[PDB]
Every structure is written in C-alpha cells, then in structure tokens.
Amino acid sequence: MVPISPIETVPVKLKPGMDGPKVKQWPLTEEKIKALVEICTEMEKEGKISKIGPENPYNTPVFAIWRKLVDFRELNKRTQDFWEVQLGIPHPAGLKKKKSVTVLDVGDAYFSVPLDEDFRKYTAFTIPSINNETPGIRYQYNVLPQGWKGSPAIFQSSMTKILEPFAAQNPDIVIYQYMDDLYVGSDLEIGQHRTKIEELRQHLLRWGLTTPDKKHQKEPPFLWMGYELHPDKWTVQPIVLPEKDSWTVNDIQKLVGKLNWASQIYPGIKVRQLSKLLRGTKALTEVIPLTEEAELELAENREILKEPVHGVYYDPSKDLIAEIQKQGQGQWTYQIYQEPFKNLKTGKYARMRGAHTNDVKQLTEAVQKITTESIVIWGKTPKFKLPIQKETWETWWTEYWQATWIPEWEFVNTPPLVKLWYQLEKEPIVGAETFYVDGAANRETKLGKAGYVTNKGRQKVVPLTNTTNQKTELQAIYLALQDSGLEVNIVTDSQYALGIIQAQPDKSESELVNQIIEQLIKKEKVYLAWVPAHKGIGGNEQVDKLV
Amino acid sequence: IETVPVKLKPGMDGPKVKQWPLTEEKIKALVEICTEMEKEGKISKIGPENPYNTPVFAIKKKDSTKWRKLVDFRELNKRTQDFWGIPHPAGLKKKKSVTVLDVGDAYFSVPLDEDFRKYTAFTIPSINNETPGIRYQYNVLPQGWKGSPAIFQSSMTKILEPFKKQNPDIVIYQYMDDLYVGSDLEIGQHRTKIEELRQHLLRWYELHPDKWTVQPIVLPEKDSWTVNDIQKLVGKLNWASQIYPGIKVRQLSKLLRGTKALTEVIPLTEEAELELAENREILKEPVHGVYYDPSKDLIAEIQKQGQGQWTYQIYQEPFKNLKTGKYARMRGAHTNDVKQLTEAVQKITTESIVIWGKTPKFKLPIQKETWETWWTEYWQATWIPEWEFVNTPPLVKLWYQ
Ligand SMILES: N#Cc1ccc2ccc(Oc3ccccc3OCCn3ccc(=O)[nH]c3=O)cc2c1
C-alpha cells in the first residue's frame, strides 16, 4: 500500500460565548430509519464518520429524502466566521484563450478532507432506533460535512495548498479552481496537454484524490453560472422571458434581473421604464399595468434578444478599448473590445437619483464605473472613446467647482454628442440691462409674488397662488430671463436659486428649473450676481413682492 | 525582542474590510515585496480560519522608482485600544525648519504579540478573482499601525538619547512611521545634521514652518467702485460678520440705493469710506476667543479656486479657524484636478500633524466615486486621514480668494 500524504487540518472554534448545538432528534418512519442505518453503515465503513459514546452532549437533527440530510443550521449559527473566496466571480471576458482546455471534477470532494478532531464532537448526530426501544445510534463526522459553514473554505484552501507545487513546476499551464471542479488549460500540443493532465491527476492521486478515469465527462461548450463557454468565444445561456397579461412585482424583479444579466453581452438593453414600477416594493403580490414606453422598450428587448451575440476572450498583447454612447433619459450604454466589431463585453449605466443633473457628470460617472469594472476584470484601465469634444471637456473641468478627472480618452463622433448648453459670465456685462429680481411667499396662505425692477425703468410683479419662497425666487429669475435681451445681468438674493444654477444642470425634475434652463440656452450672455437680503441694498426690493 | 501584550477595545471584534481592486502592476509589486517579507519572517501565510482583513495597496514615494507597500490600517487603528501620553511639542511649529524622516524599517525588528497577529491579516488580490488572494498576517510591528510607534517609544527614546543630549535646540517629534526634526540652522548645516542623524539611526523633504502663517481677510482698495464691486464687497463683509463682531455695512448699502447698472461707477461717500476703514481695522485684529480642544476633531475644508489654486481652512467650531492657507504648488499636476487635490490633502494633513499632532477630517470638493476611483494613484504618504464629500457648491469660494 502506497502511503498517500496526509492533509493538515484547519483549526476551528465556535463563536465566543457559545457552546455546541444540542437539538431534539426528529421522529422518523421505520423505512427512513433503515435507509439511514444502511447509509451511515457504508459511510462508517468508508471512514467518513465514527460511532461515539453517550458522553457527547451535542446532537444534530438528521433526515431522509435514499439520501441522508443533516441540518447543520444551528451549528452554522454557532460556528465561527470564515474567509470566503467566492466574493465576485470570474468573468468569461477576462479569460485568456488556450489551445487546449480540460476539466477534472473532484468526485469524492468534501469527504477526502479531514476535519479538526477537536471540533468533531460538535458535529455529533443520532439515528432513532426502531420503536425507540433502544438508545439511538450515535455518530460524529471525521471529515468535512456537507452543509457545514466551514467546508467550502477549508476545502478550497486545502486544494490550493496541494496544487501550488504542481503549478509552480508547470508555469506553461494554467489551472483554475472552482468548487468541485478544476479547469486546466495550455497553449501546448494536444498530446503534451493530455499528458500533463495525466501528470496532474497523478499528483492529486498522491494525496488520495480521484479524477475521472474515462474520457472526461464534460467537453466544450461549458455551461457554467449562466454562461456558455466555447473554445473560440463566450456567451450567455439562452434567455427566458415570461409573457403574461397580468404582472406582479416579483415578476418585474425577475425580468429586470434577467435583462440586466443579458445586458453584459447584448448591447442596447434598456431597463428604466420597467424599473420605475418597482417603487413601493416589499409587496410581492400586485398587478402593475404597462405604459407605451415600457411596452415599446420590452418589444425592443425582444428585438435585441432575437439573434445570438458572442463575446471574445482577452488578449493582453492588444490594447483595451471602451466606447460609450448616450441613450437618453439618463441611460448610457458601453462596449469593451480590442478588435472593432468584436466585443469583449458590453454594459449599461443609469443616472443616480437626484433633483438636477447634466450629461457631462453622468458621462464621468459612467467612465468611473467602466474603469472600476475593467480594473476588476483585466487589471487595467481601458482607453476611452467618448461622444464629447475635447474643448467641451476642457471648458467643463476647468470651470467646474468640483475636482474631476477622466483617464486617457479620444473623441468619437457618434451623435448625440455631450455638450455644454449654456455658460454664465464671470464678470458683469457692459451695455446689458440689469434686472433686480425678487420673490416672496406667505407660509400660511401659500400666496406669493415674484418680479423684477431694472435700471432702464422696466418693472414687473406677478401674483402667484399655491407657491413657496423658493418657487417665487426661481420664478422671478425666470421672469427676468423671459423679458430680457440676448445679453442680461441678473441680481438676486436667493442662495437657493444661485446654488441650483451654479450646479449647472441641463435637465431637472422641476418644470420651472427646466424652463429657466431653456431660457439660458437661448441667451448670448448671462451674468448672475448675488447680494444679501434685507441689508437695505438698493434696487433689491423685498418691499415690492411682500405686499 | 520581548513582545508586549496588546488587546482591542471592549465589545469590538477584529476588522473585516473589503479589499478593493488593484491594477496588475501593483499586484505584481505587492507579490514580489510580500514574497521577500515572507522570506524575512516579517509576514506569514494564513489559512481560512482567519476571517479578518485589512486593505492593502502599492505606491511610489518621492524620487524613487521602487514600489512600496501601504496598508490602510484605519479601521484596525480605531478598533485598537488607546495607547498611553506624550504632550505635543508646541515648539515644533515655531521652529524655522523641519525635516521628515521615514523610520518604518525600524519597526520590523520588534516582534508582534502573538495573540494579536490574527487582526493584521491582509490579502493580495487577484485579477478577475481567478485564484484566491494571497493571505498574510504580520509577525513583527506593522507600518501604519498606531500601536507600532507606541510600543517602539522606549526604543526610539534610547536610540535618540545621545543626539538629544547633544543638541538641546533641536526638537524631535514622532508620528506613525515618520520622525519630524525641527531646528533653526542653515539648509546646508540642516542637511548635514540630517545625514548625521540618519547615520546615527543607521548603525543602530525640506519643510519650513516659518514661511507659513495664518491669513487675514483683505478688502479691495480702489479709486473707483462700480455697483457690482460694492455688491460683492457688501457680500464679503456680511459673511465676515459671522466671524468679526463689529462689522457694519449699512453705509455701503446706502450707496446702492436705487436700481443702477452693475457696471456704473458710484463715488463713495465719506461715511462709506469711514465704515470701510473701521471694517479694515477690525479685520486686521485676530479672531475673538479661538482655542484648541484636544477632545474635539479637527475639520479641514478645501475649495478649488481654479488655475491650480486651492484654498483651505482648518477649524473645530464653525467660523473659528485654527489655521487657513492656500496651496498653489504645481508639480506635474497641471492637467489633473484629482492629483492636485490629493497632494493638497497630503500637505494639509502634514501641517496638521506638525501643529497639533493629529490628522483632520477632510471635506473634499469631489464626487465620492471619482475620488475613491483615483486617489491611491497619487498618494505618497505613509498615513491616511478620514474624509467626506461635499456635493453642494459653497458660496464662500471667492471669499477666500
Ligand atoms: N474560477 C473559475 C473558472 C470557472 C469556470 C471555468 C471554465 C473554463 C475555463 O477555461 C480555462 C482554464 C484554464 C486556463 C484558461 C481557460 O480559459 C480561457 C478561455 N477558454 C475557455 C473555454 C475554452 O474551451 N477555451 C478557452 O480558451 C476556466 C474556468 C475558470
């Protein structure tokens, strides 16, 4: 008998201040009991478990579905936290093409790895005897139990520790380790490849690990985590979109999820109109009707998902390029590729929740997102193609009050183009009329007034119902914009309005702000000045709108 | 050579903090560095039984192409027990010149308390989560930890004892992995003394605090004022009234009477000139009742003035500035706002360390996502401060300009 190498155990403790689980064993049918007896007998013969004495206070419930099922939920609640390596998953677009790729599954997976003996007494469970006229049969685990909290992490770390020297001794081949499967790859010849596969499974066999002896049970394409992995390309598993004349909130969530999943390779996926129906959630049962926007959008989604699209794999010797397009209504789409027309992957960005905004900011945010994603997947920042002129970006970031940056990028001309719709003067305008504006409102009656007086004698006051101070202060400025020439100076005491306008939105949720913007767009020169209210500042008339 | 027992604060588990993505080159740099450190016993590989994690990344200091390992020990620091205290050298800021030295390599000589080592666990990440990250833990005193200088205080005292007994006029301060040395010598004599001290540390960044002071509030001096000029002036004075008690603007506001064109010149009345003069006299004096409280946080606000110019204020209570300044230094940052901001934050933090012996909480004029995406690309400092993000443009921008 060849002395296979042992495996050092991972020391495991319970959470501090807690003791091992003790739970009452469930009553079982005689059939179930017999089945469990046979199974546990076979397992004990294999060495996965061992009988224990009455001394052990701890117990875990066991069931039969034959296959046994040990409910370790309580122990999991009482077991220590572990370091999980499954946070995030490898994205197929990040993989590098290999001439040969073989799959070795680890049959006899968790049961080939020993458990820390000091912890085995906490995994104890009992089998109810027939008619309970004898003491139940007591067992404990000697290996990693299925369903236990610490099994996957310990298994992964152990397998890594075993594989490390072989990997170091074979830099010319790449080995990926995922759960109960190992994926080996190489740019070598097919014979040398199969040979090194045999070497690897031998090396694994040295620790007493078994791999498929026959021709490997799985071959390309690989169906993995919703992906299809072909030799020369990758894509997603076929979409499933339910069609029903009555939609619930949960169905909307599932549809949104599947569309978002499909959007990583299918360009032009839009999900806004269907996501707007997820306001007032937490009720999974409901009937939500469709708008024409949502129906046309879903029809367009069925239009894009009509024919299959494939992404390619990553070649480090070629540059990484990300191109962005504006779709409207705060929607943005992007493609990451190296060769033209051959995408590595695609995606979308939706603007955040805010009262005001402009295109340049959203573009910046989109770029940040793509940058982070690209650093995750390929470990580098891609060169960007943006629908914005160099001069536009220049003016924007030079005059913007916040600090802002975009990595290396070039201008691609693919309308709509992102542009600055208006720019405020830095200095008062000579020969331009000066509108002193003001607005006020009564907190009780919600009645107010908004208006202006100018240097040329021009005046206006307009009475308003159902309005607030902020609204009247905006309305005054809007009035001044309406009744003035292509060049105008405007004096206000509204820190609110000045803040809004200095934020430079091209679009807003407030119709009044939108109208002010539309006014600013039509203007040639606009200087917006500010003064403190109620300081007795001449020309600024609180007395005109407070009547 | 003898480990001192270190615990955490009551009711606090060790830090679990997500490791953020790194570029391939930084990953490779960290792999090389950590391999070497492992070969030197400074760190050791750990298993899955360790849940704890602290962020880590790579940088490049001034005048060096060699990558460096920086660990974001912020969470661990605030979760680590308070270590005891040496009163801050209030004369350090009063000195003519101060030179900062990196004494981090010294810490790796002293071993870390065994039971505590599991809290310093960190992960070298992998691209695309292909293989599980390389997990390490520290065996010796880690750089960036607040306990490392506290433990090494005795040793550092013993090492710097002869130099202190030699030059009583030289002030020595220590913060984290940095040693601040103040004096009143000449730049050449300064550099030679620094070589002497570094050689004294071997066998075992010129900064001039005098060229930096606080800043007053100045008003324009004009022969002729337009309506706009007077409006802005009134705005600024009105703002400054929140700080200085006796500021009055009624006589200047009296000039604005009526509705005129913004570009129209208004001659100042005698009362207006008098009022303006009084306001000047008031602004020349310092601020009433401004004290420092060691039990209160330091807050720093930074405004972008454009053209590579930046203004900043350090305070505790609003309108009670402890320090003000204006960073306009341009090195290689001309086309990048974020780099400028990062260097500004570093400089202000350093000044704060020199004056009070602790870092301020920043209020950065940048979107969270942008800053979080790029700030590690331009960070040369061994420490890190805390920061928040102001999304609303401040009106006081030109009032510090
Ligand atoms: N964690 C993880 C994980 C999960 C599933 C995987 C499936 C296939 C695979 O494959 C690879 C395994 C080792 C090295 C290079 C690989 O893929 C490069 C691209 N590729 C793909 C499929 C194919 O048939 N041919 C190819 O060239 C690696 C995998 C890794």
Q: Which two tokens stand for residue A190?
A: 């097919």
Provide the 8-state DSSP code for B318.
T
Residues A545 and A409 both lie in one domain: no
- The verdict on A378 touching B (C-beta cutoff 8 Å) is yes
Q: Which two tokens stand for residue B248?
A: 């009055």
Q: Which residues of B212-233 are buried (b: 16+ CB within 10 A; e: fewer)?
A: eeeeebeeeeeeebbbbbbbbb
Q: Which of A467, A545, A544, A460 is nearest to A512 (CA)?
A: A467
- Partners of A325 in the β-ladder: A333
> Using CA atoms, how far apart are residues A489 and A434, in angstroms rounded to an integer?
5
Exposed/middle/buried for residue B28 (C-beta within 10 Å: 0-12, 13-18, 19+): middle
Say if CB B174 and CB B83 are below 8 A apart: no
- The one-letter amino acid code at B279 reads N
Contact B23 A538 (CB under 8 A): no
Please state, in angstroms and as integers, the Cα–Cα distance from residue A267 to each residue in A230, A304, A332, following that order.
20, 8, 11
Domain end among A389, A421, A453 = A421
Interface test with B, best of A535, A541, A544 (most B CBs within 10 A): A535
> Using CA atoms, how far apart are residues A540 and A531, in angstroms rounded to an integer?
8
- The verdict on B228 touching A (C-beta cutoff 8 Å) is yes
> Using CA atoms, how far apart are residues A16 and B15, in angstroms rounded to an integer?
16
Say if CB B306 and CB A394 are below 8 A apart: no
Q: Which of A25, A35, A34, A33 is nearest to A74 (CA)?
A: A25
> Using CA atoms, how far apart are residues B219 and B268, in angstroms rounded to an integer?
15
> Using CA atoms, how far apart are residues B261 and A539, in angstroms rounded to an integer?
10
> Using CA atoms, how far apart are residues A418 and A391, in angstroms rounded to an integer?
11
- List all residues 6 or more positions away from B273 whose beta carbon is below 8 Å from its beta carbon: none
Q: Give the H/E segment covering residue A132.
A: none
Which three-class secondary structure state does DSSP give residue B14?
coil
Exposed/middle/buried for residue A500 (C-beta within 10 Å: 0-12, 13-18, 19+): buried
> Using CA atoms, how far apart are residues B240 and A121, in angstroms rounded to an integer?
73
- The verdict on A150 touching B (C-beta cutoff 8 Å) is yes
Say if CB A159 and CB A139 are below 8 A apart: no
Residues A446 and A530 both lie in one domain: yes
> Using CA atoms, how far apart are residues B62 and B20, in angstroms rounded to an integer?
24
Which three-class secondary structure state does DSSP give residue B319?
coil
Contact B135 A83 (CB under 8 A): yes
Determine phi and psi for A187, rounding to 5 degrees: -90, 15
Report the residue among A86, A95, A96 best suited for mutation to probe ligand 1: largest number of ligand atoms under 8 A from its CB: A95
Please state, in angstroms and as integers, the Cα–Cα distance from residue B121 to each residue in A336, A376, B26, B116, following that order.
35, 22, 19, 10
Q: Edge-to-edge strand order for the sheet containing A331-339?
A: A342-350, A331-339, A321-328, A383-386, A409-411
> Using CA atoms, how far apart are residues A190 and A196, in angstroms rounded to an integer?
10
Say if CB B89 and CB B171 are below 8 A apart: yes
- Partners of A70 in the β-ladder: A62
> Using CA atoms, how far apart are residues B59 and B380, in angstroms rounded to an integer?
6
Q: Which of B232, B343, B335, B246 is nearest to B285 (CA)?
A: B246
- Residue B154 has a CB neighbour count (10 Å cut-off) of 10
Helix, strand and coil content of chain B, in percent to the nearest 5, comes to 35, 20, 45
> Using CA atoms, how far apart are residues A474 and A407, in angstroms rounded to an integer?
37
Shortest-distance Cα residue to atom 30 of ligand 1: A176
- Partners of A79 in the β-ladder: A14
Residues A27 and A144 both lie in one domain: yes
> Using CA atoms, how far apart are residues B262 and B226, in angstroms rounded to an integer?
7
**What are the counts of helices (DSSP H) followed by strands (DSSP E) for chain B?**
11, 16
Q: Give the H/E segment covering residue A467.
A: none
Rounded to 10 deg, the angle between the A151-169 and A190-205 helix axes is 130
Please state, in angstroms and as integers, the Cα–Cα distance from residue A382 to each residue in A194, A322, A323, A324, A406, following that order.
36, 6, 10, 12, 11
Residue spans of beta strands (DSSP E) within A212-355:
222-224, 227-229, 234-236, 321-328, 331-339, 342-350
Domain end among A260, A291, A314 = A314
Please state, in angstroms and as integers, the Cα–Cα distance from residue A225 to each residue in A31, A84, A222, A237, A261, following that order.
37, 18, 10, 9, 11
Round to the nearest angstrom and report the end-to-end CA distance of chain A: 105
Q: Which residues of B170-188 are buried (b: 16+ CB within 10 A; e: fewer)?
A: bbbbbbbbbbbbbbebeee
Contact A495 B304 (CB under 8 A): no
∠ CA B259-B261-B262, rounded to 5°: 110
Residues A326 and A291 both lie in one domain: no
- Partners of B97 in the β-ladder: B183
- List all residues 6 or more positions away from A491 whose beta carbon is below 8 Å from its beta carbon: A434, A435, A436, A437, A529, A530, A531, A539, A540, B231, B262
Phi-psi sector, A280: left (phi>0), alpha (psi -120 to 50), beta: left
Q: Which residue has the tokens 């006081």?
A: B396
By Cβ distance, the residue of A95, A364, A535 closest to B249 is A535
Q: What is the β-pairing status of strands B134-138 and B171-175?
A: unpaired
Longest dimension (CA), chain B: 81
Contact A368 B336 (CB under 8 A): no
> Using CA atoms, how far apart are residues A370 and A358, in angstroms rounded to an integer?
19
DSSP B50-69: ---BB-EEEE--TT--S-EE
Q: What is the β-pairing status of strands B299-306 and B361-364?
A: parallel
Task: Please list the alpha-helical segments (H only) found in B241-288.
Answer: 250-253, 270-284
The technique is: X-ray
A-proximal residues of B, 260-319, CB under 8 Å: 260-264, 304, 306
- Partners of B207 in the β-ladder: B98
Say if CB B8 and CB B79 are below 8 A apart: yes
A-proximal residues of B, 60-89, CB under 8 Å: none
> Using CA atoms, how far apart are residues A188 and A500, in angstroms rounded to an integer?
63
Residues A435 and A458 both lie in one domain: yes
Q: Which two tokens stand for residue B81?
A: 């027990």
> Using CA atoms, how far apart are residues B170 and A93, in angstroms rounded to an integer?
59
**Is the shortest distance between the CB of A226 and ligand 1 below 6 Å?**
no
∠ CA A479-A483-A484, rounded to 5°: 115
Provide the 8-state DSSP code for A162.
H
Say if CB A438 and CB A540 are below 8 A apart: yes
Say if CB A205 and CB A199 are below 8 A apart: no
Shortest-distance Cα residue to atom 19 of ligand 1: A97
Cis, peptide link before residue A416, omega less than 30° from 0: yes
User: Residue ranges of A for the binding site?
Assistant: 105, 180-181, 438, 473, 493, 544
By Cβ distance, the residue of A365, A430, A538 closest to B259 is A538
- Residue A283 has a CB neighbour count (10 Å cut-off) of 9
* Residue A204: half-sphere exposure toward Cβ, Cα within 13 Å: 26
Q: Which residues of B253-268 are buried (b: 16+ CB within 10 A; e: fewer)?
A: bebbeebbbbbeebeb
Which three-class secondary structure state does DSSP give residue B324?
strand
Q: Which two tokens stand for residue A193?
A: 């490849």
Contact A539 B256 (CB under 8 A): yes
Please state, in angstroms and as integers, the Cα–Cα distance from residue B118 to each residue in A326, B47, B50, B142, following that order.
48, 11, 7, 12
Q: Which residue of chain A is at minimal alpha-carbon distance from B129? A: A90
Q: Which two tokens stand for residue A171?
A: 């830099």
Say if CB B333 and CB B301 are below 8 A apart: no
Longest dimension (CA), chain A: 109
Q: Which residue of chain A is at minimal alpha-carbon distance from B27? A: A379
Provide the 8-state DSSP code for A237.
P
Say if CB A418 and CB A359 are below 8 A apart: yes
Please state, in angstroms and as integers, the Cα–Cα distance from residue A194 to each residue in A64, A103, A216, A217, following that order.
41, 11, 11, 14
Residues A234 and A104 both lie in one domain: no
- The verdict on B373 touching A (C-beta cutoff 8 Å) is yes
Q: Which two tokens stand for residue A379?
A: 């470990």
> Using CA atoms, how far apart are residues A64 and A35, in angstroms rounded to an integer?
8
Residues A226 and A330 both lie in one domain: no
> Using CA atoms, how far apart are residues B119 and B12, in angstroms rounded to an integer?
12
Say if CB A304 and CB A271 are below 8 A apart: no
> Using CA atoms, how far apart are residues B58 and A103, in angstroms rounded to an integer?
36
Q: Which residue has the tokens 């959007």?
A: A263
- List all residues 6 or more positions away from A161 whose beta carbon is below 8 Å from its beta carbon: none
By Cβ distance, the residue of A80, A81, A404 closest to B370 is A404
Exposed/middle/buried for residue A233 (C-beta within 10 Å: 0-12, 13-18, 19+): middle
Q: Which of B59, B41, B54 is nearest to B133 (CA)?
A: B54
Contact A405 B336 (CB under 8 A): yes
Which three-class secondary structure state does DSSP give residue B172?
strand
Residue A482 CA to ligand 1 center (angstroms) comes to 63
Q: Which two tokens stand for residue A146?
A: 């299925």
Residues A191 and A135 both lie in one domain: no
DSSP B74-126: HHHHHHBPPP--PPP-TTTTTSSEEEEEE-HHHHTTSBPPGGGGGGS-EEE--
Domain end among A279, A314, A349 = A314
- List all residues 6 or more positions away from B151 whose beta carbon is below 8 Å from its beta carbon: B4, B6, B110, B141
The residue ranges of every structural domain in chain B are: 5-90+116-156, 91-115+157-206, 207-292, 293-401
Question: What was the resolution (in A) of this experimentally determined structure?
Answer: 2.8
Residue A313 CA to ligand 1 center (angstroms) comes to 10
> Using CA atoms, how far apart are residues B252 and B268, in angstroms rounded to an integer?
8
> Using CA atoms, how far apart are residues B143 and B175, in angstroms rounded to an integer?
11
- The verdict on A459 touching B (C-beta cutoff 8 Å) is no
Per the structure, the complete domain to which residue A383 belongs is given by 315-421
Q: Which two tokens stand for residue B348?
A: 């202000």
> Using CA atoms, how far apart are residues A176 and B129, in angstroms rounded to an integer?
10
> Using CA atoms, how far apart are residues A433 and A454, in angstroms rounded to an integer?
7
Q: Which of A130, A18, A33 is nearest to A76 (CA)?
A: A18
- The verdict on B250 touching A (C-beta cutoff 8 Å) is yes
> Using CA atoms, how far apart are residues B322 and B338, in angstroms rounded to an integer?
26
Provide the 8-state DSSP code for B246.
T
What residues of chain A lie within 8 A of the CB of B119, using their CB?
none
Determine phi and psi for B137, rounding to 5 degrees: -135, 155
Residues A32 and A178 both lie in one domain: no
- Partners of B175 in the β-ladder: B178
Q: Give the H/E segment covering residue A514.
A: helix A511-522
Q: How many domains does chain A have?
A: 5
Cα radius of gyration rounded to whole Å, chain B:
25
> Using CA atoms, how far apart are residues B351 and A407, in angstroms rounded to an integer?
30
Q: Which of B293, B291, B327, B316 is nearest to B400 (CA)?
A: B327
